[PDB]
Amino acid sequence: TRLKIVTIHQEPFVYVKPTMSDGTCKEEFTVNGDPVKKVICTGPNDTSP
Ligand SMILES: *[C@@H]1O[C@H](CO)[C@@H](O)[C@H](O)[C@H]1NC(C)=O
Incomplete structure (x- = not known):
């Protein structure tokens, strides 16, 4: 059911960002209006x- 996944810090494939307040993410939109x-x-x- 639960599969632990690991990845490396590579920006054009895995964007890594610091959180806003506590473990949350700012819901950004694309140019097509896709969250x-x-x-x-x-x-x-x-x-x-
Ligand atoms: C992580 O390291 C960066 C660079 O020193 C720092 O700006 C940031 O505050 C650190 N994260 C925290 C919240 O400890």
Whole structure:
């Protein structure tokens, strides 16, 4: 039922954005007026140092 998915930070394929207030995403529109179906991914900010 639940499948854990991993991906790498690559902008033209996986856009990664900081949240607005707390775990939420600003519903942006395309040039065709399509709201982009986003997802709440879990990632670190930078490397361990
Ligand atoms: C993540 O790192 C960037 C660069 O230092 C910083 O601007 C941002 O505030 C960090 N995220 C948080 C909320 O800790």
